[PDB]
Amino acid sequence: HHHGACPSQCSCSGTTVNCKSKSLASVPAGIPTTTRVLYLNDNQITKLEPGVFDRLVNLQTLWLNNNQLTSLPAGLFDSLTQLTILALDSNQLQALPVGVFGRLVDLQQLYLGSNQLSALPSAVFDRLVHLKELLMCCNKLTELPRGIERLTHLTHLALDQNQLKSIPHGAFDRLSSLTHAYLFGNPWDCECRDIMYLRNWVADHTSIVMRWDGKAVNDPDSAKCAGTNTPVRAVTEASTSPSKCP
Ligand SMILES: [Cl-]
Incomplete structure (x- = not known):
C-alpha cells in the first residue's frame, strides 16, 4: 500500500474494511470516511461508543x-443515511433506543435475530419505507411489533422462535410482497x-410460510398450536372461544 487507510487487525480492499473474526474487543480506530462495507462481525465487542460511526457517512453495509x-447508544446510526444492510443478529440486545433506525431511510435489510428483545419502541420501524427484509427470530417477543403492519415492501419477515401467541387482526394484509414468512417455534394460542x-x-398463503434448516423450507404446517403438532391453519372456528384470550 503506497498509502495507509486500513486499521490494525483488519484487511481492506477498495471501499471495504474487513475486521471479521479478528478477536476484537472494540471497534478499531481510523476506519476511513469513504468506507462503503464494514465487517465487524464474529468478534467479542461488548459496547459501541456513542458517535463511533458518525464519520462513516458512505456506509452501505x-x-x-x-x-x-x-x-x-442513542443516535448510533444517525449519520448512516446511505445504509442498506444492517446486521445486529446474534448479540445480547435487550432493548433498542427510541429513534435508533430513524435516519436509515434507505435501509433494505435489517437483521435482529438471536437477541434478547422483548418489546420495542412503537415507532421503531416507521421511517424504514424501503425495507425488504426484517429478520427477528429467536428473541423474547410476546406481541407483534407495532409498525411491521406498515412495511409494505417486505419480501422476508422472520418471527420464528419467539413467544408470540397470536397476530392482531389484519396485521399482514398490507404485506402483499411477502415471499418468505417464518412463524414456527411460537406458542400460538389456538x-x-x-x-x-x-x-x-396461513391457509390463504401456504406457499410462503417457511421453516429454516440452513435454507428456507416451505411448510405451512410449521406454525403449530402450543404444545401440539396441530397446525394453526387447521384450527376450526368451533374449537375456539371468544374468552380464552390472555
Ligand atoms: Cl432471524
Whole structure:
C-alpha cells in the first residue's frame, strides 16, 4: 500500500474494511470516511461508543452480528443515511433506543435475530419505507411489533422462535410482497378466537410460510398450536372461544 487507510487487525480492499473474526474487543480506530462495507462481525465487542460511526457517512453495509452487544447508544446510526444492510443478529440486545433506525431511510435489510428483545419502541420501524427484509427470530417477543403492519415492501419477515401467541387482526394484509414468512417455534394460542386471523392468513398463503434448516423450507404446517403438532391453519372456528384470550 503506497498509502495507509486500513486499521490494525483488519484487511481492506477498495471501499471495504474487513475486521471479521479478528478477536476484537472494540471497534478499531481510523476506519476511513469513504468506507462503503464494514465487517465487524464474529468478534467479542461488548459496547459501541456513542458517535463511533458518525464519520462513516458512505456506509452501505454494516455487519455487527455475532458480538456481545447488550445495548446501542442513542443516535448510533444517525449519520448512516446511505445504509442498506444492517446486521445486529446474534448479540445480547435487550432493548433498542427510541429513534435508533430513524435516519436509515434507505435501509433494505435489517437483521435482529438471536437477541434478547422483548418489546420495542412503537415507532421503531416507521421511517424504514424501503425495507425488504426484517429478520427477528429467536428473541423474547410476546406481541407483534407495532409498525411491521406498515412495511409494505417486505419480501422476508422472520418471527420464528419467539413467544408470540397470536397476530392482531389484519396485521399482514398490507404485506402483499411477502415471499418468505417464518412463524414456527411460537406458542400460538389456538384456544382464543383471535387465532382465526392467523389461521386464515396461513391457509390463504401456504406457499410462503417457511421453516429454516440452513435454507428456507416451505411448510405451512410449521406454525403449530402450543404444545401440539396441530397446525394453526387447521384450527376450526368451533374449537375456539371468544374468552380464552390472555
Ligand atoms: Cl432471524
